[PDB]
Amino acid sequence: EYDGLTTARYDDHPEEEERQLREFRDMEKEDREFPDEIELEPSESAIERLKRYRGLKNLYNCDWQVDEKDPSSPAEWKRLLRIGNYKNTKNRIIKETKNEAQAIAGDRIRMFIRFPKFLLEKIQDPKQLLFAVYGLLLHEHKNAVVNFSLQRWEQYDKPVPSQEPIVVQYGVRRYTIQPLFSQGSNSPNNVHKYERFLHPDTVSVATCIAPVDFTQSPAIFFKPSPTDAKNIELIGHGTFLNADHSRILAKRAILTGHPFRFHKTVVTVRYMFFRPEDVEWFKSIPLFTKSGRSGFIKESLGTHGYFKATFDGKLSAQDVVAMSLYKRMWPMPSLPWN
Amino acid sequence: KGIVLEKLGIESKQPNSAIRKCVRVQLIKNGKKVTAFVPNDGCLNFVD
Amino acid sequence: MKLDTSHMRYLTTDDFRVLQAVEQGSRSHEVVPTPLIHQISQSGTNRAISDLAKLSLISKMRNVKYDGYRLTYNGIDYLALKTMLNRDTVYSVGNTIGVGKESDIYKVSDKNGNPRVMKIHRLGRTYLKKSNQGANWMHLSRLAANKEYQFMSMLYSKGFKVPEPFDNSRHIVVMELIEGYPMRRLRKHKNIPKLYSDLMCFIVDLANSGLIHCDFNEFNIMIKFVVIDFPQCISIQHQDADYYFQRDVDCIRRFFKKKLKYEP
RNA sequence: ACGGAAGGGCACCACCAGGAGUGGAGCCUGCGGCUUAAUUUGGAAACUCACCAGGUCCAGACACAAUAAGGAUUGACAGAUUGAGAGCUCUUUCUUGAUUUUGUGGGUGGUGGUGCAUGGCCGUAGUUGGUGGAGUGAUUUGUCUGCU
Numbered sequence: 001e002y003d004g005l006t007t008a009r010y011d012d013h014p015e016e017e018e019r020q021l022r023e024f025r026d027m028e029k030e031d032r033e034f035p036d037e038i039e040l041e042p043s044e045s046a047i048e049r050l051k052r053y054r055g056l057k058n059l060y061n062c063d064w065q066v067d068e069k070d071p072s073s074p075a076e077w078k079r080l081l082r083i084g085n086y087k088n089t090k091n092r093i094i095k096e097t098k099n100e101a102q103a104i105a106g107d108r109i110r111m112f113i114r115f116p117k118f119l120l121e122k123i124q125d126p127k128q129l130l131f132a133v134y135g136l137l138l139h140e141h142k143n144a145v146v147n148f149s150l151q152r153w154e155q156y157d158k159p160v161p162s163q164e165p166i167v168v169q170y171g172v173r174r175y176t177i178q179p180l181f182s183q184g185s186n187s188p189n190n191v192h193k194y195e196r197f198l199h200p201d202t203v204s205v206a207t208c209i210a211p212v213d214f215t216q217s218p219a220i221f222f223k224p225s226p227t228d229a230k231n232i233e234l235i236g237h238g239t240f241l242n243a244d245h246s247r248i249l250a251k252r253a254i255l256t257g258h259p260f261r262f263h264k265t266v267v268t269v270r271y272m273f274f275r276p277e278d279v280e281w282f283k284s285i286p287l288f289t290k291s292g293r294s295g296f297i298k299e300s301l302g303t304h305g306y307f308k309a310t311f312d313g314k315l316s317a318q319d320v321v322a323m324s325l326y327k328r329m330w331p332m333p334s335l336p337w338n
Numbered sequence: 339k340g341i342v343l344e345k346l347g348i349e350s351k352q353p354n355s356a357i358r359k360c361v362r363v364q365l366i367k368n369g370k371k372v373t374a375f376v377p378n379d380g381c382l383n384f385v386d
Numbered sequence: 387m388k389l390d391t392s393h394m395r396y397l398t399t400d401d402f403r404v405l406q407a408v409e410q411g412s413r414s415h416e417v418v419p420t421p422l423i424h425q426i427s428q429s430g431t432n433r434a435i436s437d438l439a440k441l442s443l444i445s446k447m448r449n450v451k452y453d454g455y456r457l458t459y460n461g462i463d464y465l466a467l468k469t470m471l472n473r474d475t476v477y478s479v480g481n482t483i484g485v486g487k488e489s490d491i492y493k494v495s496d497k498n499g500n501p502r503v504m505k506i507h508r509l510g511r512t513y514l515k516k517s518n519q520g521a522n523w524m525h526l527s528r529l530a531a532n533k534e535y536q537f538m539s540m541l542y543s544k545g546f547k548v549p550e551p552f553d554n555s556r557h558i559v560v561m562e563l564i565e566g567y568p569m570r571r572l573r574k575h576k577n578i579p580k581l582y583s584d585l586m587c588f589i590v591d592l593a594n595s596g597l598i599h600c601d602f603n604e605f606n607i608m609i610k611f612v613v614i615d616f617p618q619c620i621s622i623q624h625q626d627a628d629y630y631f632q633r634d635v636d637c638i639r640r641f642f643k644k645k646l647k648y649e650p
Numbered sequence: 651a652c653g654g655a656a657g658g659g660c661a662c663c664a665c666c667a668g669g670a671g672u673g674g675a676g677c678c679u680g681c682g683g684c685u686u687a688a689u690u691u692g693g694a695a696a697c698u699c700a701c702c703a704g705g706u707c708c709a710g711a712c713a714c715a716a717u718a719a720g721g722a723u724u725g726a727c728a729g730a731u732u733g734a735g736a737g738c739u740c741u742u743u744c745u746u747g748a749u750u751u752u753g754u755g756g757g758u759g760g761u762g763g764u765g766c767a768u769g770g771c772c773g774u775a776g777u778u779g780g781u782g783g784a785g786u787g788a789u790u791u792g793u794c795u796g797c798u
Contacts, residue, residue, distance in 0.1 A: 261690095296395075301687055302687090303702085306702095483683070517653080
């Protein structure tokens, strides 16, 4: 809640789209060099921007209770199938598929499908094309939080932002998905760092809400390119990893400051904060630097800009000083693509 | 030659403490099930 | 002086357990080389030691070969405060100290936000040049905390109104804030007659086990009585006990005459 | 090597015998902490001051475009404003001689880091290595029991 006007959550221990493309290439270009470093407007209070953020010692070590009173989650969060061990799901379901298959393969079947007269006008004859019908499994219709594993295509080098829509063909079905990207790592709390753009080569993980696969099909990722050559500009390929609701992506925002005068306590602040209101929120949260020290800026003036910091360690020079705040990202729901 | 059953990872001997990403193969000609190492880094994403 | 509030926070995950790793071996191996930490990756232990050796929680001996360590007076301090925080207590230190001679009164924040008193036990406060490391500051001051700690718990269990010990681990005893004011600094109170009637009878309370206080003179207890600095007491087996009787009483027969003007 | 055994000595930064004391009262000062715009930092009213609040003023090498000898620009004795022998500016107009100016591109400077790169300067009775002899070797005798 907004209970506590101190104390951030810590738990103490056609050409316009091309200009949008140049904007995406610029934001990924700078987001490569200084990643996750939000640049505060000094005119505007850094409290309202950073209300929902929660500061952490380390992503990997801490523990979140899985959801929260969020309200930027989809409200259909409880309208999701929760899975235990995905291995102990799908072998069971394939086990029931063996034991209850009425139709042995190589058998001729006239098939009776409930079907609208709305959709007869897209049907062709089964000679000049390939009306072919794929079965499904038990829970393969219904929504849960999934994870893919993107990797870029071989020729491809254009940047891909993190919530632009991408058509995903995993197995047979094909959905329109605005994903959530994260690098692949194995934290025990299953809490991983959100990506704002996607890496040059090393295989990452997307995440979105889509109905489940029980077979871990390969997937091709593309955006439709209707104006272009053949009807698709392919982006990537990948593999349906699993259906994890607990895959918690954390949006990292880095506040960055400069030191002025050394040798006294340690260090002061130039660009980090603006007001003495910025003290009370962000100074139980520790602080890092670039082979250096830890924790606890202490108050001073803010009337021009300056916050006399404390630290733990030795070396300080014409350097930078950076803290962090973490926020969960939430999946977006998806639609089919026809 | 064999069929991969699943992909694993290790918690090996001291001092080198890590997760080394082996797999489970079942051989064809015996039906025996033997663990197997994947070489040069990456390449766990090559197998399924 | 010897104690420090600065670096408690900046240790990492393995540290507390790595700094613990020397402690389990300490009871058997009191000289601990580097790998002896491992079993109990190749990043983990020395980045802890880089803390522990440079943050002075583990002493270092310099040799070309792998070096044997023996855990440092500073290192138990946070190890204590680790299990301290882990029982539950001590969210933060308070701004009111609290600096005594042999013991450290620390306003300290328990869970629920309870300001309370922490007492670190180690003698002769200044770190001293004359000490042999590993025992005198740790281990002498280590045992002696529980020696006192289970007295008050046993003495508070008697029912006499006194402080109750909250927590003890590794030469740190925590107990109630016990607000009140000592009679050493006493400023004003109107009613002595039952005050001292309690006092002189508070003595036979102190004497109900066949004991005599010997600190019952001034600078001990406060208007709630709130009494402190217990350890000096004398047994009935203790041979000279009868001499100390009139010592205690008459010294507080002494006080009142000057300040608050009463006589038994 | 072992904060390990034991044993020898030394010492008003130890004890004995005392002596004068502190700690108890008030106040001065120093440290921490607390508060504060800041209480610089581990014999302070200005200066010191490194801190805080506002305030003016300056920067800009050099390559290039343009402009500028039909003014680029320096300084200039009041008065206003500003807290001020601020031409910062201004009401202006004396003089300057390209020393430079607007814009682009574009670089030097650091008493910045290294005494942990090299010189030179300043202050301030026990160690050993040799030749032996012993042992393939780690090593050892030398560096030693007795008397004064």
